[PDB]
Design an enzyme around this catalytic site. Structure first.
Site, short mmCIF file in Angstrom:
data_model
loop_
_atom_site.label_atom_id
_atom_site.label_comp_id
_atom_site.label_asym_id
_atom_site.label_seq_id
_atom_site.Cartn_x
_atom_site.Cartn_y
_atom_site.Cartn_z
N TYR A 165 0.72 -1.25 0.09
CA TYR A 165 -0.10 0.19 0.03
C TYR A 165 1.05 1.42 -0.03
CZ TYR A 165 -4.44 2.44 0.96
OH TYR A 165 -5.63 3.23 0.98
N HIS A 213 -4.57 -0.30 -2.27
CA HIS A 213 -5.62 0.50 -2.07
C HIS A 213 -6.61 -0.22 -2.98
CE1 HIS A 213 -3.68 1.52 -5.90
NE2 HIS A 213 -4.80 2.08 -6.16
N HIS A 217 -12.90 -3.32 2.22
CA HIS A 217 -13.15 -3.41 3.75
C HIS A 217 -14.18 -4.63 3.89
CE1 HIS A 217 -15.67 -2.94 7.28
NE2 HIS A 217 -14.49 -2.65 7.85
N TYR A 225 -3.87 -5.09 7.39
CA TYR A 225 -2.64 -4.15 7.14
C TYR A 225 -1.48 -4.31 8.00
CZ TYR A 225 -6.06 -1.42 4.60
OH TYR A 225 -7.10 -0.89 3.36
N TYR A 255 -10.85 -2.17 8.52
CA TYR A 255 -10.36 -0.53 8.39
C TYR A 255 -9.17 -0.17 9.05
CZ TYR A 255 -11.86 4.30 8.65
OH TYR A 255 -12.08 5.55 8.37
#
Length: 257
Positions: A165, A213, A217, A225, A255
């Site tokens: 990311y 990206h 979700h 992450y 998230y």
């Protein structure tokens, strides 16, 4: 914690360094208190840097290598003090004795350290990351309201780095000043930094150097992450599997922020 052989008030011989959590982060040897010969530096994310150090014990030379977490894919070439000046794609073929033997892959793509700024996301927006391109692809998501999604190209087990990311680096304040329509792709990197993939770069025909990206979700995610030190993008986040994943499965994450 450092553990090393010492001869006459000085480190001489085999040595290993662990970080606070006890992860092995360095393996090599010292000569006269200075790192010497072929040394291995391991990052918490599973990546590593390997090569003969220079006389100041620094990872500087023409045959230094950054090795991805699969312990096979590598970027081989010129590094100064651990920063990639020019690395070419290669495969770690074997490690006879202390040293790695590399085989270059066909092609002319060279990579270099290219950390982003507030404005610039990359000097080569369309040069894909070689490790990520073998593992994931973008396609229509199976979440209806979502649009595009990120999918695995292959079957892999738990704890596998699949995607990176990267994005422009901006402040939490700027993100919290204007709003929502422009925050679709923001991820909090740390207390001081937010990574964003804006403007026209949110589309793969315009930016495909990294694809993290793109993961959507989910409240029952199969990925997470994670912090990652990348030789081209610098300190960013990556997407790592939480469990085994089959080929063509959509990758989803909780998230960030």
């Amino acid at each position: 914690v450092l553990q090393g052989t010492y001869v006459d008030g000085e480190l001489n011989g085999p040595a290993q360094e662990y970080d606070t959590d006890g992860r092995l982060i360095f393996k090599g040897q010292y000569k006269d208190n200075i790192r010497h010969g072929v040394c291995w530096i391991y990052y918490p994310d599973g990546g590593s840097l390997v090569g003969e150090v220079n006389e100041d014990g620094e990872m500087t030379g023409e045959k230094i290598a950054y090795v991805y977490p699969d312990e096979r894919t590598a970027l081989y070439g010129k590094f100064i003090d651990g920063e990639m000046i020019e690395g070419k794609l290669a495969t770690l073929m074997s490690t006879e004795e202390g040293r790695p033997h590399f085989e270059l892959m066909p092609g002319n793509s060279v990579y270099h350290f290219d950390k982003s700024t507030s404005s610039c996301i990359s000097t080569n927006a369309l040069l894909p990351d070689p490790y990520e391109s073998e593992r994931v692809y973008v396609a229509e998501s199976l979440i209806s309201s979502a649009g595009e999604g990120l999918f695995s190209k292959v079957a892999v087990g738990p704890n596998t780095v699949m995607s990176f990311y990267n994005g422009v680096r901006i402040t939490h304040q700027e993100v919290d000043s204007r709003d929502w329509a422009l925050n679709g792709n923001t991820l909090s990197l740390d207390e001081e930094t937010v990574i964003d993939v804006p403007e026209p770069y949110n589309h793969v025909s315009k930016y495909c150097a990294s694809l993290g990206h793109k993961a959507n979700h989910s409240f029952t995610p199969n990925c997470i992450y994670d912090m990652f030190v990348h030789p081209r993008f610098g300190p960013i986040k990556c997407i790592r599997t939480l469990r085994a994943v089959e080929a063509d499965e959509e990758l989803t994450v909780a998230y960030g922020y």
